[PDB]
PDB file of C-alpha atoms and ligand atoms in Angstrom:
ATOM      1  CA  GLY A   1       4.613 -11.867  25.344  1.00 31.56           C
ATOM      2  CA  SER A   2       7.143 -12.459  22.604  1.00 34.18           C
ATOM      3  CA  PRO A   3       6.180  -9.956  19.878  1.00 28.90           C
ATOM      4  CA  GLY A   4       5.261 -12.306  17.048  1.00 29.87           C
ATOM      5  CA  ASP A   5       3.024  -9.515  15.714  1.00 29.39           C
ATOM      6  CA  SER A   6       6.072  -8.147  13.864  1.00 26.51           C
ATOM      7  CA  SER A   7       4.889  -9.634  10.558  1.00 26.35           C
ATOM      8  CA  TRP A   8       1.233  -8.553  10.625  1.00 26.99           C
ATOM      9  CA  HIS A   9       0.436  -4.910   9.850  1.00 27.81           C
ATOM     10  CA  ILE A  10      -3.005  -3.615  10.864  1.00 29.57           C
ATOM     11  CA  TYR A  11      -4.169  -0.070  10.150  1.00 32.11           C
ATOM     12  CA  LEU A  12      -7.226   2.041   9.391  1.00 32.81           C
ATOM     13  CA  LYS A  13      -8.325   2.940   5.873  1.00 30.27           C
ATOM     14  CA  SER A  14     -10.233   5.971   4.569  1.00 28.46           C
ATOM     15  CA  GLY A  15     -14.001   5.558   4.599  1.00 26.22           C
ATOM     16  CA  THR A  16     -16.844   7.794   3.427  1.00 28.54           C
ATOM     17  CA  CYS A  17     -16.894  10.415   6.190  1.00 26.26           C
ATOM     18  CA  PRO A  18     -15.932  13.978   5.199  1.00 24.99           C
ATOM     19  CA  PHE A  19     -12.902  14.023   7.512  1.00 26.41           C
ATOM     20  CA  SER A  20     -10.069  11.779   8.694  1.00 24.79           C
ATOM     21  CA  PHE A  21      -9.403   9.763  11.829  1.00 25.33           C
ATOM     22  CA  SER A  22      -5.883  11.132  12.319  1.00 26.38           C
ATOM     23  CA  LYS A  23      -7.018  14.769  11.960  1.00 23.36           C
ATOM     24  CA  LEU A  24      -9.923  14.679  14.425  1.00 26.16           C
ATOM     25  CA  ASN A  25      -7.590  15.813  17.219  1.00 25.79           C
ATOM     26  CA  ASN A  26      -7.066  19.132  15.429  1.00 26.11           C
ATOM     27  CA  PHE A  27      -9.331  22.068  16.252  1.00 24.40           C
ATOM     28  CA  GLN A  28     -12.413  20.613  14.569  1.00 27.95           C
ATOM     29  CA  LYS A  29     -15.865  21.579  15.827  1.00 29.61           C
ATOM     30  CA  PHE A  30     -19.051  19.499  15.947  1.00 30.88           C
ATOM     31  CA  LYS A  31     -22.246  19.175  17.985  1.00 29.12           C
ATOM     32  CA  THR A  32     -22.490  15.450  18.848  1.00 29.66           C
ATOM     33  CA  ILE A  33     -20.509  12.459  17.616  1.00 26.62           C
ATOM     34  CA  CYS A  34     -21.347   9.190  19.430  1.00 29.31           C
ATOM     35  CA  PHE A  35     -18.897   6.683  18.007  1.00 28.63           C
ATOM     36  CA  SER A  36     -19.885   3.011  18.017  1.00 28.03           C
ATOM     37  CA  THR A  37     -18.569  -0.366  16.864  1.00 29.45           C
ATOM     38  CA  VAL A  38     -21.877  -1.775  15.552  1.00 26.67           C
ATOM     39  CA  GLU A  39     -24.075  -0.905  12.592  1.00 28.61           C
ATOM     40  CA  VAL A  40     -26.640   1.863  13.126  1.00 27.64           C
ATOM     41  CA  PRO A  41     -28.749   3.613  10.451  1.00 26.94           C
ATOM     42  CA  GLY A  42     -27.376   6.809   8.948  1.00 26.07           C
ATOM     43  CA  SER A  43     -23.684   6.607   9.824  1.00 25.70           C
ATOM     44  CA  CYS A  44     -20.423   6.566   7.881  1.00 25.60           C
ATOM     45  CA  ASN A  45     -17.590   4.198   8.773  1.00 25.81           C
ATOM     46  CA  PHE A  46     -13.816   3.555   8.612  1.00 22.22           C
ATOM     47  CA  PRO A  47     -12.830   0.024   7.519  1.00 26.26           C
ATOM     48  CA  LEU A  48     -10.044  -2.004   9.126  1.00 27.74           C
ATOM     49  CA  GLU A  49      -7.353  -3.924   7.253  1.00 23.97           C
ATOM     50  CA  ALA A  50      -4.875  -6.715   7.999  1.00 24.02           C
ATOM     51  CA  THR A  51      -1.953  -7.827   5.845  1.00 21.74           C
ATOM     52  CA  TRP A  52       1.172 -10.031   5.913  1.00 23.72           C
ATOM     53  CA  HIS A  53       4.201  -8.082   4.615  1.00 23.33           C
ATOM     54  CA  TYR A  54       1.989  -6.085   2.217  1.00 26.93           C
ATOM     55  CA  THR A  55       1.236  -9.065  -0.040  1.00 26.27           C
ATOM     56  CA  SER A  56      -2.497  -9.799   0.320  1.00 27.71           C
ATOM     57  CA  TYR A  57      -5.134  -7.476   1.775  1.00 26.71           C
ATOM     58  CA  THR A  58      -8.312  -8.323   3.675  1.00 26.78           C
ATOM     59  CA  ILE A  59     -11.022  -6.468   5.603  1.00 24.22           C
ATOM     60  CA  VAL A  60     -11.503  -7.352   9.279  1.00 22.82           C
ATOM     61  CA  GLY A  61     -13.819  -4.842  10.956  1.00 18.51           C
ATOM     62  CA  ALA A  62     -15.036  -1.245  10.976  1.00 16.78           C
ATOM     63  CA  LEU A  63     -15.702   1.779  13.177  1.00 18.29           C
ATOM     64  CA  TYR A  64     -19.084   3.504  12.863  1.00 18.29           C
ATOM     65  CA  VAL A  65     -19.365   7.230  13.588  1.00 16.77           C
ATOM     66  CA  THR A  66     -22.218   9.750  13.530  1.00 15.23           C
ATOM     67  CA  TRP A  67     -22.122  13.537  13.755  1.00 17.37           C
ATOM     68  CA  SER A  68     -24.146  16.732  13.359  1.00 20.30           C
ATOM     69  CA  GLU A  69     -22.990  20.230  12.474  1.00 21.90           C
ATOM     70  CA  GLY A  70     -22.512  22.586  15.393  1.00 20.98           C
ATOM     71  CA  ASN A  71     -20.181  24.885  17.301  1.00 22.24           C
ATOM     72  CA  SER A  72     -20.126  23.352  20.787  1.00 24.61           C
ATOM     73  CA  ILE A  73     -17.603  20.478  20.926  1.00 23.80           C
ATOM     74  CA  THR A  74     -13.973  20.928  19.858  1.00 22.74           C
ATOM     75  CA  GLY A  75     -11.092  18.473  19.623  1.00 22.17           C
ATOM     76  CA  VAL A  76      -7.737  19.025  21.317  1.00 21.08           C
ATOM     77  CA  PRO A  77      -4.248  17.698  20.436  1.00 21.06           C
ATOM     78  CA  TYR A  78      -3.369  16.572  23.966  1.00 23.51           C
ATOM     79  CA  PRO A  79      -4.985  16.877  27.415  1.00 24.57           C
ATOM     80  CA  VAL A  80      -3.272  19.804  29.134  1.00 25.08           C
ATOM     81  CA  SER A  81      -4.133  19.495  32.830  1.00 26.01           C
ATOM     82  CA  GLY A  82      -4.109  22.123  35.572  1.00 28.48           C
ATOM     83  CA  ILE A  83      -5.535  25.057  33.602  1.00 27.63           C
ATOM     84  CA  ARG A  84      -8.904  26.809  33.693  1.00 27.98           C
ATOM     85  CA  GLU A  85      -9.166  28.231  30.152  1.00 31.37           C
ATOM     86  CA  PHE A  86      -7.456  26.551  27.199  1.00 32.27           C
ATOM     87  CA  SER A  87      -5.495  29.099  25.165  1.00 33.50           C
ATOM     88  CA  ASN A  88      -2.080  29.464  23.560  1.00 32.72           C
ATOM     89  CA  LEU A  89      -0.116  32.158  21.735  1.00 30.78           C
ATOM     90  CA  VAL A  90       3.355  32.148  20.148  1.00 31.25           C
ATOM     91  CA  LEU A  91       4.903  35.419  18.989  1.00 26.37           C
ATOM     92  CA  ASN A  92       7.721  36.780  16.847  1.00 29.11           C
ATOM     93  CA  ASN A  93       7.999  34.072  14.177  1.00 30.34           C
ATOM     94  CA  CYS A  94       5.904  31.995  11.837  1.00 34.60           C
ATOM     95  CA  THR A  95       3.074  29.884  13.270  1.00 34.56           C
ATOM     96  CA  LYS A  96      -0.249  28.300  12.222  1.00 30.49           C
ATOM     97  CA  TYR A  97      -2.974  30.248  13.988  1.00 31.15           C
TER      98      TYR A  97
ATOM     99  CA  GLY D   1     -35.595 -29.558 -18.841  1.00 27.76           C
ATOM    100  CA  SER D   2     -38.452 -27.869 -20.638  1.00 30.36           C
ATOM    101  CA  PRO D   3     -37.514 -24.162 -20.673  1.00 34.70           C
ATOM    102  CA  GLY D   4     -40.167 -22.807 -18.326  1.00 36.09           C
ATOM    103  CA  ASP D   5     -38.010 -19.700 -17.846  1.00 38.41           C
ATOM    104  CA  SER D   6     -39.464 -18.255 -21.063  1.00 41.16           C
ATOM    105  CA  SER D   7     -41.680 -15.904 -19.034  1.00 39.53           C
ATOM    106  CA  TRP D   8     -39.347 -14.749 -16.252  1.00 40.07           C
ATOM    107  CA  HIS D   9     -36.724 -12.120 -17.094  1.00 40.53           C
ATOM    108  CA  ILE D  10     -33.779 -11.752 -14.696  1.00 40.68           C
ATOM    109  CA  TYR D  11     -30.978  -9.244 -15.245  1.00 43.56           C
ATOM    110  CA  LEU D  12     -28.525  -6.966 -13.461  1.00 46.14           C
ATOM    111  CA  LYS D  13     -29.262  -3.327 -12.680  1.00 45.63           C
ATOM    112  CA  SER D  14     -26.885  -0.372 -12.294  1.00 44.52           C
ATOM    113  CA  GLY D  15     -25.525   0.052  -8.780  1.00 46.27           C
ATOM    114  CA  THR D  16     -23.367   2.689  -7.095  1.00 48.30           C
ATOM    115  CA  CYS D  17     -19.968   1.640  -8.458  1.00 50.10           C
ATOM    116  CA  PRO D  18     -18.270   4.090 -10.848  1.00 49.54           C
ATOM    117  CA  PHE D  19     -18.295   1.590 -13.729  1.00 47.42           C
ATOM    118  CA  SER D  20     -20.529  -1.049 -15.310  1.00 50.22           C
ATOM    119  CA  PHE D  21     -20.647  -4.834 -15.242  1.00 48.58           C
ATOM    120  CA  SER D  22     -20.891  -5.243 -19.022  1.00 48.80           C
ATOM    121  CA  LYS D  23     -17.906  -2.934 -19.662  1.00 50.15           C
ATOM    122  CA  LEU D  24     -15.477  -4.541 -17.208  1.00 49.80           C
ATOM    123  CA  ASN D  25     -14.176  -6.807 -19.983  1.00 50.14           C
ATOM    124  CA  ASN D  26     -12.856  -3.766 -21.855  1.00 45.39           C
ATOM    125  CA  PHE D  27      -9.296  -2.594 -21.238  1.00 44.02           C
ATOM    126  CA  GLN D  28      -9.861  -1.330 -17.695  1.00 41.46           C
ATOM    127  CA  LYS D  29      -7.043  -1.267 -15.149  1.00 40.87           C
ATOM    128  CA  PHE D  30      -7.178  -1.807 -11.382  1.00 42.47           C
ATOM    129  CA  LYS D  31      -5.046  -3.146  -8.534  1.00 43.98           C
ATOM    130  CA  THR D  32      -7.313  -5.681  -6.768  1.00 39.59           C
ATOM    131  CA  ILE D  33     -11.020  -6.427  -7.084  1.00 42.29           C
ATOM    132  CA  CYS D  34     -12.155  -9.415  -4.970  1.00 42.22           C
ATOM    133  CA  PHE D  35     -15.806  -9.867  -5.856  1.00 44.47           C
ATOM    134  CA  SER D  36     -18.068 -11.482  -3.264  1.00 44.67           C
ATOM    135  CA  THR D  37     -21.723 -12.418  -2.797  1.00 48.00           C
ATOM    136  CA  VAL D  38     -21.965 -11.454   0.894  1.00 48.20           C
ATOM    137  CA  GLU D  39     -21.974  -8.078   2.610  1.00 51.14           C
ATOM    138  CA  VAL D  40     -18.572  -6.669   3.590  1.00 52.22           C
ATOM    139  CA  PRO D  41     -17.867  -3.118   4.837  1.00 51.76           C
ATOM    140  CA  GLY D  42     -16.812  -0.537   2.273  1.00 50.20           C
ATOM    141  CA  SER D  43     -18.082  -2.049  -0.975  1.00 48.41           C
ATOM    142  CA  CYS D  44     -20.512  -1.062  -3.720  1.00 51.41           C
ATOM    143  CA  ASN D  45     -22.965  -3.522  -5.253  1.00 53.75           C
ATOM    144  CA  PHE D  46     -25.078  -4.427  -8.309  1.00 53.67           C
ATOM    145  CA  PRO D  47     -28.700  -5.339  -7.482  1.00 55.98           C
ATOM    146  CA  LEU D  48     -30.635  -8.163  -9.133  1.00 56.56           C
ATOM    147  CA  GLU D  49     -34.160  -8.038 -10.543  1.00 54.46           C
TER     148      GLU D  49
HETATM  149  C1  LIG L   1      -5.464  38.571  27.463  1.00 58.88           C
HETATM  150  O1  LIG L   1      -4.862  39.229  28.571  1.00 58.88           O
HETATM  151  C2  LIG L   1      -5.001  38.523  29.813  1.00 58.88           C
HETATM  152  C3  LIG L   1      -4.420  39.419  30.882  1.00 58.88           C
HETATM  153  O2  LIG L   1      -4.943  39.104  32.165  1.00 58.88           O
HETATM  154  C4  LIG L   1      -4.312  37.164  29.714  1.00 58.88           C
HETATM  155  O3  LIG L   1      -4.531  36.424  30.911  1.00 58.88           O
HETATM  156  C5  LIG L   1      -3.292  36.265  31.649  1.00 58.88           C
HETATM  157  O4  LIG L   1      -2.362  35.433  30.960  1.00 58.88           O
HETATM  158  C6  LIG L   1      -1.103  35.324  31.640  1.00 58.88           C
HETATM  159  C7  LIG L   1      -0.195  34.521  30.737  1.00 58.88           C
HETATM  160  O5  LIG L   1      -0.504  33.136  30.790  1.00 58.88           O
HETATM  161  C8  LIG L   1      -1.294  34.694  33.022  1.00 58.88           C
HETATM  162  O6  LIG L   1      -0.062  34.778  33.731  1.00 58.88           O
HETATM  163  C9  LIG L   1       0.589  33.518  34.087  1.00 58.88           C
HETATM  164  O7  LIG L   1       0.582  32.557  33.018  1.00 58.88           O
HETATM  165  C10 LIG L   1       1.474  31.468  33.312  1.00 58.88           C
HETATM  166  C11 LIG L   1       1.665  30.622  32.066  1.00 58.88           C
HETATM  167  O8  LIG L   1       2.788  29.772  32.285  1.00 58.88           O
HETATM  168  C12 LIG L   1       3.829  30.120  31.346  1.00 58.88           C
HETATM  169  O9  LIG L   1       4.392  31.395  31.660  1.00 58.88           O
HETATM  170  C13 LIG L   1       5.143  31.470  32.894  1.00 58.88           C
HETATM  171  C14 LIG L   1       5.589  32.911  33.072  1.00 58.88           C
HETATM  172  O10 LIG L   1       6.547  32.955  34.123  1.00 58.88           O
HETATM  173  C15 LIG L   1       6.311  30.486  32.817  1.00 58.88           C
HETATM  174  O11 LIG L   1       7.070  30.559  34.014  1.00 58.88           O
HETATM  175  C16 LIG L   1       5.761  29.067  32.629  1.00 58.88           C
HETATM  176  O12 LIG L   1       6.830  28.127  32.599  1.00 58.88           O
HETATM  177  C17 LIG L   1       4.894  28.979  31.370  1.00 58.88           C
HETATM  178  O13 LIG L   1       5.800  29.086  30.270  1.00 58.88           O
HETATM  179  C18 LIG L   1       0.901  30.674  34.504  1.00 58.88           C
HETATM  180  O14 LIG L   1       1.792  29.623  34.844  1.00 58.88           O
HETATM  181  C19 LIG L   1       0.687  31.598  35.726  1.00 58.88           C
HETATM  182  O15 LIG L   1       0.033  30.874  36.760  1.00 58.88           O
HETATM  183  C20 LIG L   1       0.745  31.075  37.998  1.00 58.88           C
HETATM  184  O16 LIG L   1       0.359  32.297  38.589  1.00 58.88           O
HETATM  185  C21 LIG L   1      -1.041  32.402  38.918  1.00 58.88           C
HETATM  186  C22 LIG L   1      -1.267  33.793  39.469  1.00 58.88           C
HETATM  187  O17 LIG L   1      -0.556  33.892  40.697  1.00 58.88           O
HETATM  188  C23 LIG L   1       0.137  35.155  40.744  1.00 58.88           C
HETATM  189  O18 LIG L   1      -0.644  36.117  41.429  1.00 58.88           O
HETATM  190  C24 LIG L   1      -0.929  35.806  42.809  1.00 58.88           C
HETATM  191  C25 LIG L   1      -1.846  36.888  43.346  1.00 58.88           C
HETATM  192  O19 LIG L   1      -3.132  36.710  42.763  1.00 58.88           O
HETATM  193  C26 LIG L   1       0.396  35.707  43.577  1.00 58.88           C
HETATM  194  O20 LIG L   1       0.133  35.374  44.930  1.00 58.88           O
HETATM  195  C27 LIG L   1       1.285  34.628  42.933  1.00 58.88           C
HETATM  196  O21 LIG L   1       2.520  34.524  43.634  1.00 58.88           O
HETATM  197  C28 LIG L   1       1.499  34.912  41.445  1.00 58.88           C
HETATM  198  O22 LIG L   1       2.330  36.074  41.390  1.00 58.88           O
HETATM  199  C29 LIG L   1      -1.406  31.297  39.924  1.00 58.88           C
HETATM  200  O23 LIG L   1      -2.798  31.350  40.197  1.00 58.88           O
HETATM  201  C30 LIG L   1      -1.037  29.913  39.357  1.00 58.88           C
HETATM  202  O24 LIG L   1      -1.346  28.901  40.318  1.00 58.88           O
HETATM  203  C31 LIG L   1      -1.056  27.593  39.777  1.00 58.88           C
HETATM  204  O25 LIG L   1      -0.747  26.686  40.828  1.00 58.88           O
HETATM  205  C32 LIG L   1      -1.831  26.409  41.740  1.00 58.88           C
HETATM  206  C33 LIG L   1      -1.289  25.523  42.846  1.00 58.88           C
HETATM  207  O26 LIG L   1      -0.618  26.351  43.792  1.00 58.88           O
HETATM  208  C34 LIG L   1      -2.973  25.759  40.953  1.00 58.88           C
HETATM  209  O27 LIG L   1      -4.045  25.457  41.833  1.00 58.88           O
HETATM  210  C35 LIG L   1      -3.447  26.727  39.862  1.00 58.88           C
HETATM  211  O28 LIG L   1      -4.527  26.153  39.133  1.00 58.88           O
HETATM  212  C36 LIG L   1      -2.288  27.125  38.943  1.00 58.88           C
HETATM  213  O29 LIG L   1      -1.985  25.957  38.177  1.00 58.88           O
HETATM  214  C37 LIG L   1       0.432  29.872  38.921  1.00 58.88           C
HETATM  215  O30 LIG L   1       1.198  29.929  40.128  1.00 58.88           O
HETATM  216  C38 LIG L   1      -0.086  32.866  35.354  1.00 58.88           C
HETATM  217  O31 LIG L   1      -1.419  32.451  35.103  1.00 58.88           O
HETATM  218  C39 LIG L   1      -2.352  35.449  33.819  1.00 58.88           C
HETATM  219  O32 LIG L   1      -2.666  34.741  35.013  1.00 58.88           O
HETATM  220  C40 LIG L   1      -3.626  35.642  33.003  1.00 58.88           C
HETATM  221  N1  LIG L   1      -4.577  36.465  33.731  1.00 58.88           N
HETATM  222  C41 LIG L   1      -5.893  36.227  33.743  1.00 58.88           C
HETATM  223  C42 LIG L   1      -6.726  37.178  34.547  1.00 58.88           C
HETATM  224  O33 LIG L   1      -6.388  35.286  33.131  1.00 58.88           O
HETATM  225  C43 LIG L   1      -4.870  36.383  28.531  1.00 58.88           C
HETATM  226  O34 LIG L   1      -4.133  35.178  28.354  1.00 58.88           O
HETATM  227  C44 LIG L   1      -4.800  37.212  27.251  1.00 58.88           C
HETATM  228  N2  LIG L   1      -5.422  36.498  26.148  1.00 58.88           N
HETATM  229  C45 LIG L   1      -4.810  36.283  24.980  1.00 58.88           C
HETATM  230  C46 LIG L   1      -5.601  35.529  23.955  1.00 58.88           C
HETATM  231  O35 LIG L   1      -3.672  36.682  24.760  1.00 58.88           O
HETATM  232  C1  LIG L   2      11.175  30.929  16.548  1.00 57.72           C
HETATM  233  O1  LIG L   2      10.203  30.146  17.242  1.00 57.72           O
HETATM  234  C2  LIG L   2      10.796  29.079  17.998  1.00 57.72           C
HETATM  235  C3  LIG L   2       9.662  28.266  18.576  1.00 57.72           C
HETATM  236  O2  LIG L   2       9.960  26.877  18.556  1.00 57.72           O
HETATM  237  C4  LIG L   2      11.739  29.640  19.063  1.00 57.72           C
HETATM  238  O3  LIG L   2      12.376  28.557  19.736  1.00 57.72           O
HETATM  239  C5  LIG L   2      12.523  28.882  21.137  1.00 57.72           C
HETATM  240  O4  LIG L   2      13.773  29.525  21.366  1.00 57.72           O
HETATM  241  C6  LIG L   2      13.971  29.928  22.729  1.00 57.72           C
HETATM  242  C7  LIG L   2      15.276  30.689  22.764  1.00 57.72           C
HETATM  243  O5  LIG L   2      15.476  31.432  21.570  1.00 57.72           O
HETATM  244  C8  LIG L   2      13.957  28.705  23.645  1.00 57.72           C
HETATM  245  O6  LIG L   2      14.033  29.137  25.000  1.00 57.72           O
HETATM  246  C9  LIG L   2      15.193  28.597  25.671  1.00 57.72           C
HETATM  247  O7  LIG L   2      14.825  27.786  26.784  1.00 57.72           O
HETATM  248  C10 LIG L   2      15.939  27.226  27.515  1.00 57.72           C
HETATM  249  C11 LIG L   2      15.387  26.344  28.622  1.00 57.72           C
HETATM  250  O8  LIG L   2      14.958  25.106  28.065  1.00 57.72           O
HETATM  251  C12 LIG L   2      15.554  24.023  28.818  1.00 57.72           C
HETATM  252  O9  LIG L   2      15.087  24.012  30.172  1.00 57.72           O
HETATM  253  C13 LIG L   2      13.691  23.685  30.357  1.00 57.72           C
HETATM  254  C14 LIG L   2      13.378  23.762  31.841  1.00 57.72           C
HETATM  255  O10 LIG L   2      14.128  24.824  32.429  1.00 57.72           O
HETATM  256  C15 LIG L   2      14.397  24.477  33.807  1.00 57.72           C
HETATM  257  O11 LIG L   2      15.328  25.387  34.388  1.00 57.72           O
HETATM  258  C16 LIG L   2      14.867  26.745  34.550  1.00 57.72           C
HETATM  259  C17 LIG L   2      16.018  27.550  35.126  1.00 57.72           C
HETATM  260  O12 LIG L   2      17.086  27.545  34.185  1.00 57.72           O
HETATM  261  C18 LIG L   2      13.631  26.745  35.456  1.00 57.72           C
HETATM  262  O13 LIG L   2      13.166  28.076  35.624  1.00 57.72           O
HETATM  263  C19 LIG L   2      12.535  25.881  34.822  1.00 57.72           C
HETATM  264  O14 LIG L   2      11.366  25.892  35.639  1.00 57.72           O
HETATM  265  C20 LIG L   2      13.036  24.458  34.574  1.00 57.72           C
HETATM  266  O15 LIG L   2      13.171  23.862  35.867  1.00 57.72           O
HETATM  267  C21 LIG L   2      13.427  22.293  29.780  1.00 57.72           C
HETATM  268  O16 LIG L   2      12.061  21.959  29.973  1.00 57.72           O
HETATM  269  C22 LIG L   2      13.778  22.280  28.284  1.00 57.72           C
HETATM  270  O17 LIG L   2      13.516  20.994  27.729  1.00 57.72           O
HETATM  271  C23 LIG L   2      12.348  21.067  26.884  1.00 57.72           C
HETATM  272  O18 LIG L   2      12.689  20.793  25.531  1.00 57.72           O
HETATM  273  C24 LIG L   2      13.177  19.459  25.268  1.00 57.72           C
HETATM  274  C25 LIG L   2      13.552  19.389  23.799  1.00 57.72           C
HETATM  275  O19 LIG L   2      14.704  20.201  23.592  1.00 57.72           O
HETATM  276  C26 LIG L   2      12.089  18.449  25.657  1.00 57.72           C
HETATM  277  O20 LIG L   2      12.559  17.132  25.416  1.00 57.72           O
HETATM  278  C27 LIG L   2      11.743  18.621  27.144  1.00 57.72           C
HETATM  279  O21 LIG L   2      10.753  17.676  27.533  1.00 57.72           O
HETATM  280  C28 LIG L   2      11.305  20.055  27.440  1.00 57.72           C
HETATM  281  O22 LIG L   2      10.034  20.213  26.807  1.00 57.72           O
HETATM  282  C29 LIG L   2      15.233  22.693  28.066  1.00 57.72           C
HETATM  283  O23 LIG L   2      16.019  21.609  28.566  1.00 57.72           O
HETATM  284  C30 LIG L   2      16.796  28.375  28.076  1.00 57.72           C
HETATM  285  O24 LIG L   2      17.931  27.837  28.741  1.00 57.72           O
HETATM  286  C31 LIG L   2      17.248  29.321  26.954  1.00 57.72           C
HETATM  287  O25 LIG L   2      17.956  30.425  27.517  1.00 57.72           O
HETATM  288  C32 LIG L   2      18.956  30.890  26.583  1.00 57.72           C
HETATM  289  O26 LIG L   2      18.430  31.917  25.755  1.00 57.72           O
HETATM  290  C33 LIG L   2      18.049  33.130  26.437  1.00 57.72           C
HETATM  291  C34 LIG L   2      17.421  34.056  25.412  1.00 57.72           C
HETATM  292  O27 LIG L   2      16.216  33.455  24.948  1.00 57.72           O
HETATM  293  C35 LIG L   2      19.293  33.728  27.101  1.00 57.72           C
HETATM  294  O28 LIG L   2      18.941  34.924  27.779  1.00 57.72           O
HETATM  295  C36 LIG L   2      19.879  32.713  28.095  1.00 57.72           C
HETATM  296  O29 LIG L   2      21.035  33.258  28.724  1.00 57.72           O
HETATM  297  C37 LIG L   2      20.185  31.378  27.406  1.00 57.72           C
HETATM  298  O30 LIG L   2      21.311  31.629  26.562  1.00 57.72           O
HETATM  299  C38 LIG L   2      16.062  29.795  26.116  1.00 57.72           C
HETATM  300  O31 LIG L   2      15.313  30.682  26.935  1.00 57.72           O
HETATM  301  C39 LIG L   2      12.676  27.903  23.445  1.00 57.72           C
HETATM  302  O32 LIG L   2      12.746  26.684  24.173  1.00 57.72           O
HETATM  303  C40 LIG L   2      12.447  27.599  21.964  1.00 57.72           C
HETATM  304  N1  LIG L   2      11.181  26.908  21.764  1.00 57.72           N
HETATM  305  C41 LIG L   2       9.980  27.430  22.050  1.00 57.72           C
HETATM  306  C42 LIG L   2       8.801  26.548  21.766  1.00 57.72           C
HETATM  307  O33 LIG L   2       9.846  28.559  22.518  1.00 57.72           O
HETATM  308  C43 LIG L   2      12.783  30.551  18.427  1.00 57.72           C
HETATM  309  O34 LIG L   2      13.558  31.208  19.422  1.00 57.72           O
HETATM  310  C44 LIG L   2      12.103  31.601  17.555  1.00 57.72           C
HETATM  311  N2  LIG L   2      13.085  32.453  16.899  1.00 57.72           N
HETATM  312  C45 LIG L   2      14.003  32.019  16.026  1.00 57.72           C
HETATM  313  C46 LIG L   2      14.918  33.066  15.466  1.00 57.72           C
HETATM  314  O35 LIG L   2      14.094  30.838  15.700  1.00 57.72           O
END
């Protein structure tokens, strides 16, 4: 209720996967992913960290992710609703196509 | 008491860390290390033989 969590900072680290958690929403393409929160064979992971005012670090948990190369499943920045074919185009000055 | 360990040889191997256990005493620089003898996520290891 009262936000006593102001002192503790908890965030994700960088694991061994060949991508990043914050850049999965970009237009990245895969075949299957199947995230999980328990250990399974053949799967990279992102550790979790907890700290008090950036003095002493400790590891708390992890997130386990699998994947397989493909061209079927694509991430999206945010869920646009009400359309039938996701596309966008901005003209006449610099963009990132 | 009597050194019966004369036959058995036990030593460390080379793991997956990008350094060595016998050369950690040299002038090597880090930020934190925090050795442990139990499994924790995101950590290399030295086997025993
Ligand atoms: C390659 O070329 C093709 C050429 O066909 C491109 O496809 C066309 O792309 C156009 C541009 O998007 C489509 O036109 C409209 O796009 C609008 C996008 O919104 C932005 O732009 C408008 C422009 O005024 C702006 O106001 C708005 O704020 C946004 O900035 C859409 O909103 C719009 O949808 C509306 O119109 C359609 C069509 O209805 C029209 O025609 C009817 C007759 O068939 C007529 O009775 C209507 O009065 C109207 O004149 C309509 O279906 C939509 O309905 C919405 O609401 C209902 C609920 O009532 C909902 O159920 C439904 O799902 C909709 O949400 C809405 O009123 C236009 O789509 C154009 O439609 C595209 N044509 C085709 C065939 O796809 C293509 O993009 C190009 N590709 C590339 C890569 O460039
Ligand atoms: C380089 O690229 C950039 C891309 O970022 C581009 O920037 C665009 O610039 C154009 C103009 O040059 C901008 O278009 C303007 O849009 C104005 C309207 O925006 C207001 O109104 C929105 C809703 O309109 C209501 O009312 C109308 C009727 O008036 C109605 O039809 C609508 O349905 C609706 O009910 C409103 O949503 C919007 O707020 C958005 O943004 C805020 C943040 O600011 C956000 O918090 C909101 O949630 C929301 O997303 C805003 O309040 C419009 O008034 C304006 O018109 C003037 O210019 C035209 C010429 O263009 C004149 O003819 C006219 O007389 C006015 O003087 C103009 O059309 C556009 O928004 C910019 N951004 C994008 C992404 O396109 C640059 O132009 C490019 N070029 C250069 C050189 O930089």
